Amino acid sequence: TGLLDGKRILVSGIITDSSIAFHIARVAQEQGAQLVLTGFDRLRLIQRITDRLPAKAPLLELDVQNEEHLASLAGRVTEAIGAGNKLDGVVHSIGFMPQTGMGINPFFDAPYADVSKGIHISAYSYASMAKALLPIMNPGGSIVGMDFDPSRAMPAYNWMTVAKSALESVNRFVAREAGKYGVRSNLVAAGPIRTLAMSAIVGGALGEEAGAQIQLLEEGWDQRAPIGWNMKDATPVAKTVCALLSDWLPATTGDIIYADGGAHTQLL
Template sequence: MGLLDGKRLLVTGVITETSIAFSVAKVAQEQGAEVVLTGFGRLSLVERVARRLPKPAPVVELDVTSPEHLEALADRVREHVDGLDGVLHSIGFAPASCLGEGFLDAPFADVATAMEVSAFSFKSLAVATLPLFGESGGSILGMDFDARVAWPAYNWMGVAKAALESTSRYLARELGPRRIRVNLVAAGPVRTMAAKSIPGFVQFEEAWEGRAPLGWDINDATPVAMSCAALMSDWFPATTGEMIHVDGGFHAMGV
């Protein structure tokens, strides 16, 4: 019997097999969940990757900045499952000007894009999927990179993640009466396609070496995926508005 037997999950953010979202979808299926994926842009690539899961998963097109896509999402998901018990938001983007060395130089238009895609979309996705949750509620989970501190090169994406953290708390307040839990997983650095687009990402990799008391493998998203599966199961019935660190303990160390 799996941890997610009978659960119906919507997983966003799968791009390649190295995506954290792919690992979450894989672990979720192994634990008995029925999974639907969303894709944006190169949809054929996502569909190809979806066929590499233990059970090929359907893919629904979703641009989280498109009102039309968001409005149609519930109906598109119902083509594959009759409702949802959990949603994973694993979406983030910042224009090049928002990353690297130019924190003081990024124009507001680019910052606004980073905020809309990386933070506001958490609310947009929650609202779009609400009609799919039943009376028993469920779990909405977001992927985070601890924004309580300033990171080198992360710049305005770090600010957007701070906004995501605040958004999750307000969503937890609003959706609690519907028995929907809203939490974040603050993962350590994992070598994904998105991570490779961050200038200076190697600094994160080097920082984790020797400081995470449990150790940390930047090439293995499985520990993150297992934690996500647990949070979307029934085993955290009274946990909401929380940020769970899955980083080998790095966040708790000084030097």
């Protein structure tokens, strides 16, 4: 029936209805998956958003910078899905970089405290999540993370591109660990998407120039992409994550699957 029919998947990262994790959770539910969701900080707002999903799914609090939340994760998840029952999928749609290391502040000027917070959330946490959830994962299982091609440097992205470079390395190692459990670990490298991750720069909140630079990136992304790129559509990226959570890419681990319209394969 569904692509993930009878699968128990954990989906992290829903904040708004435009969050990549929301469309991942939506497509996953449409494809028969039973979900457990994790949210950070504004939990009464996340509960309101996740209520708009095709189905009821338990919401658990998880700050990946909180040692206690990580220590109790597996326990709280098992309680949510029933004892003796395990996870088949894990979705890491978590990331952040403070305004000093991303946007208009000069690259050099970002303090290591802010860069460190950014690497802990967007890169180190991918391993943190796998450490906590892998002992409650079933053989054949899948851990998918969200990436943004960091092989080439670009304007404004700055220390987020550095944190993504680190995430890619982490993923490669997580795969070594996950393989002992019969679990795959991969990243989906998406093109730009109009979520909370971009809303300040796009909305002219960092100035007119900053907004212009992103619009050139989104325009150029669409040009290069042989099959086009709609920065307003999160569903192609959502579908890709669901391909990796399914049993249809069973010899793929420690890798990057590009869901970007084909932009990264083209120069112009």
